[PDB]
Every structure is written in C-alpha cells, then in structure tokens.
Amino acid sequence: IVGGYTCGANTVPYQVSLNSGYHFCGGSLINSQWVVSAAHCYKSGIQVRLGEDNINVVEGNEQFISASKSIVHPSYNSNTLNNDIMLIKLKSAASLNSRVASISLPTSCASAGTQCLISGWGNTKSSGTSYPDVLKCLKAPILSDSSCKSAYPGQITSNMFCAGYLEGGKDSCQGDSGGPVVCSGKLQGIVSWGSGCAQKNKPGVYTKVCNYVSWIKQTIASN
Numbered sequence: 283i284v285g286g287y288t289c290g291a292n293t294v295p296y297q298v299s300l301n302s303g304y305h306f307c308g309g310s311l312i313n314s315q316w317v318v319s320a321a322h323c324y325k326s327g328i329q330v331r332l333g334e335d336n337i338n339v340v341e342g343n344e345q346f347i348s349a350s351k352s353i354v355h356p357s358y359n360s361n362t363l364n365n366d367i368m369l370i371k372l373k374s375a376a377s378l379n380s381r382v383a384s385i386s387l388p389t390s391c392a393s394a395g396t397q398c399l400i401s402g403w404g405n406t407k408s409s410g411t412s413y414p415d416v417l418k419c420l421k422a423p424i425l426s427d428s429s430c431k432s433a434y435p436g437q438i439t440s441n442m443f444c445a446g447y448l449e450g451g452k453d454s455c456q457g458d459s460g461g462p463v464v465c466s467g468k469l470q471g472i473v474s475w476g477s478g479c480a481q482k483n484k485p486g487v488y489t490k491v492c493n494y495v496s497w498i499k500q501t502i503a504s505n
C-alpha cells in the first residue's frame with residue numbers, strides 16, 4: 283500500500299497473509315474454512331496466516347493453518363489477468379472471534395464513487411522499495427468504467443474494476459495482491475494488477491467479486 287496509513291493491529295479481521303516461508307500475497311477470510319485470493323497468487327505449499335498485524339513478530343492473535351486445497355477459477359487467464367480469483371480451503375476451521383472474522387460476500391456490485399478499504403503488506407513506495415511489517419490501509423473510491431478503460435485501453439474486462447486516485451500517490455502495490463477491497467462491509471474487490479504503483483492515470487485494477495458469488499458459493503458447497 284502506497285500513500286495509506288497503519289491500520290492498527292487486528293482492525294481488519296478478515297485480512298489474511300499467505301505464507302510459503304514468507305509473506306507473498308494477501309487474501310480474505312469468507313468463512314471459517316475458506317479464503318479468497320488472486321489466482322495469480324497461486325502456488326503450492328501455502329500456509330494461511332490469520333490474526334496477523336506484524337508479520338515478522340508473534341504478537342498473540344495469530345492462527346497458522348495450512349491449505350488443504352486450492353481452486354483457481356476455471357477461466358483464469360494469466361496473460362490478461364481476466365478472472366484473477368482463487369479459493370483456498372483450510373485444513374482445519376479457523377476459530378472466529380473479534381480479531382479473526384469472515385467478510386460478507388456482496389449481494390450486488392458496487393458502483394463507481396463508492397468508498398472502499400484496501401489493505402495489505404505490500405510495497406509502500408512508488409519509486410523505491412520498502413515492505414512494511416504491520417498492516418497498511420487505504421480508503422479509495424471505485425472509479426468509473428470509462429475512466430478505467432481510458433486509463434488501460436484494451437485491457438479492462440467486465441470482471442475488473444479500477445479504484446484509487448488518477449492523480450497518483452495512493453494505490454495498492456506488489457505484495458498486496460490477493461487482498462481485500464471492502465466497501466460498506468462487503469468484499470467487492472481483490473487486489474489484482476496495475477501499471478507500477480500509485481502512478482498518475484494508472485489506478486489499481488481489482489477483480490470484481492460480485493461476478494463470482496455464484497461460483498464461490500457453489501464451489502464451497504461441493505468441496
């Protein structure tokens with residue numbers, strides 16, 4: 283997260299860190315046994331880390347649970363990042379409490395202009411590299427489809443939306459991928475891609491979760 287703020291420990295209780303020896307992506311807890319992330323975060327050997335703030339210090343609210351199964355969206359295209367979504371099942375159910383909690387799936391898509399909360403442990407610099415240890419937050423609006431498509435000609439599908447600031451300076455970034463975009467208490471986006479980070483006229487591009495609720499629900503019901 284570039285241009286954001288320190289969330290505060292466990293203030294984003296659905297935020298998960300995906301760990302393969304090191305943090306490499308975010309994700310979102312959607313029930314006690316399932317995490318939503320970006321398909322481009324797929325790898326083998328994922329441990330899901332819940333209840334994290336400082337990802338380099340054991341502070342006392344962590345739950346570390348290995349993944350039992352990963353399901354990349356059937357139509358994920360790694361070249362275009364269309365359908366950049368995957369589901370991760372935990373080997374055991376997380377213990378849900380105030381600091382570790384699921385986030386609701388949307389019942390409708392969010393409109394341009396809605397303000398959302400974006401969070402992650404990604405890079406905090408737009409020209410340079412500094413990875414934070416504690417969770418960073420950014421409040422950002424969803425952008426219009428016309429400004430999104432004009433920022434990224436030929437690249438925005440119906441499964442994507444832009445959020446952020448066309449002036450630059452505030453964005454998600456590398457290491458935030460897979461994490462949440464939450465708007466009015468619903469998971470509306472997944473951190474997916476962008477050109478650099480926090481660049482002028484290059485806002486963040488997010489997986490449009492509302493398009494996937496039927497796939498998410500049926501997948502969970504059968505796995």
Ligand SMILES: O[C@@H]1[C@@H](O)[C@@H](O)OC[C@H]1O
Nearest residue numbers: 361362363434436437438
């Ligand atoms: O985002 C672009 C993607 O849509 C495709 O065109 O491959 C090149 C990328 O820059």
Ligand SMILES: O[C@@H]1[C@@H](O)[C@H](O)OC[C@H]1O
Nearest residue numbers: 340342343344345346347
């Ligand atoms: O019990 C585990 C604890 O040892 C670790 O510190 O955080 C994750 C928990 O699952």
Ligand SMILES: [Ca+2]
Nearest residue numbers: 336339340341
């Ligand atoms: Ca920790």
